[PDB]
DNA sequence: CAGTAT
DNA sequence: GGCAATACTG
């Protein structure tokens, strides 16, 4: 009933929230329209309002089949319709696990020793079945130290572009010098198994950034959105990049008014922290001391699905 | 920006 | 008025 959540999934990220007021009390076409296109990877509340209003599409099956004949689709929307089927099968962990495999022997062999892949997401909290990959990619403890950001040097780039020469990673749906997001695809397996194609995501993070990162990006959503409010609530700012020590609120207002000024984020370039966001750092080595400094109990990954 | 993604 | 926080793109 008040799973009529999935309908304010129409951007009401709050009103959603909420239902997961009294009631005691206890549709629309292009509302459901609008719920079904916004399965589509590319397609928000707007683009899908917009294929409705603009298209006449009510079904995710009329945009598979109109796609190509509407001119004003962007590329991201073009693969998300694409492998739209793919991408709505779950992977199962034991295919994960091959992910895994391949990513860090690719990664040994085109970046070599000094770089290290890991996969986080909901495989990584043991969940049977995950919606993607989520792969972080950075420098080894052990790697020598570098002058500038990693993403500087292009290093994902070299490394999608190994991947995609070994026709594993096959479509883009958007990419940077910190992410990538594409469909990857495991080689055959000889009867010969065919893989479907995979969301996979690989995000480039910093070494120092790696125990926040690894947080992060093993989540889940919902847990890292309650880790954060109580890191908020101790005048602390915490991101993948690291934990960083505000203080008051207006303290934390003030160094945004140099550092952040943006609809973007707190004051990162590149993966790296400002100078003077830097200096807000606190420094942490594991998972762990995040959960220390925050004065929350440690949970395993598996216990992150609040 | 103002949409899209995580 | 604000709510977790950040990346890529037309
Ligand atoms: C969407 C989103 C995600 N995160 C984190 C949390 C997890 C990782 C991966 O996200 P994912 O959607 O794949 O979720 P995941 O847990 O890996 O589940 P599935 O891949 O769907 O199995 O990123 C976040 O901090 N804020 C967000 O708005
Ligand atoms: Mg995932
Ligand atoms: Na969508
Ligand atoms: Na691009």
């Given at each position: 009933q008040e799973m009529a959540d999935l309908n304010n999934a129409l951007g009401e990220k709050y009103k959603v929230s909420s239902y997961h007021k009294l009631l005691k009390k206890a549709t629309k076409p292009k509302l459901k329209a609008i719920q079904e296109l916004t399965q589509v990877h590319g397609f928000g509340p707007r683009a899908a309002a917009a294929l409705?209003?603009?298209?006449?599409?009510?079904?995710v099956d009329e945009l598979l089949?109109?796609?190509?004949?509407?001119?004003?689709?962007?590329?991201?929307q073009r693969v998300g319709i694409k492998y739209f089927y793919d991408i709505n099968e779950k992977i199962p962990m034991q295919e994960s696990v091959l992910h895994?495999?391949?990513?860090?022997?690719?990664?040994?062999?085109?970046?070599?020793?000094d770089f290290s892949i890991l996969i986080c997401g909901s495989y990584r909290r043991r969940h049977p079945f995950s919606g993607d990959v989520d792969a972080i990619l950075s420098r080894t403890l052990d790697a020598p130290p570098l002058s500038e950001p990693v993403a500087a040097t292009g290093?994902?780039?070299?490394?999608?572009?190994?991947?995609?020469?070994?026709?594993?990673?096959?479509a883009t749906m958007a990419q940077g010098p910190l992410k990538y997001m594409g469909m990857?695809?495991?080689?055959?397996?000889?009867?010969?198994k065919?893989?479907?194609?995979?969301?996979?995501?690989?995000?480039?993070?910093?070494?120092?950034?790696?125990?926040?990162?690894?947080?992060?990006?093993?989540?889940?959503?919902n847990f890292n959105v309650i880790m954060r409010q109580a890191a908020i609530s101790k005048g602390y700012l915490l991101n993948e990049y690291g934990l960083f020590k505000l203080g008051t609120p207006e303290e934390a207002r003030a160094l945004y008014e140099r550092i952040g000024i943006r609809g973007k984020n707190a004051g990162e370039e590149l993966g790296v922290p400002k100078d003077e966001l830097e200096d807000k750092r606190v420094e942490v080595r594991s998972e762990?001391?995040?959960?220390?400094?925050?004065?929350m109990p440690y949970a395993k990954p598996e216990n992150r699905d609040p």
């Open positions: 409705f209003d603009r298209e006449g599409i009510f079904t089949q109109k796609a190509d004949s509407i001119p004003s689709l962007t590329d991201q895994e495999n391949y990513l860090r022997e690719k990664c040994m062999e085109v970046l070599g020793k290093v994902l780039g070299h490394f999608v572009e190994f991947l995609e020469s070994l026709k594993y990673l096959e990857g695809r495991l080689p055959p397996r000889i009867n010969t065919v893989y479907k194609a995979r969301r996979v995501d690989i995000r480039l993070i910093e070494t120092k950034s790696v125990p926040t990162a690894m947080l992060t990006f093993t989540g889940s959503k762990q001391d995040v959960f220390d400094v925050l004065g």
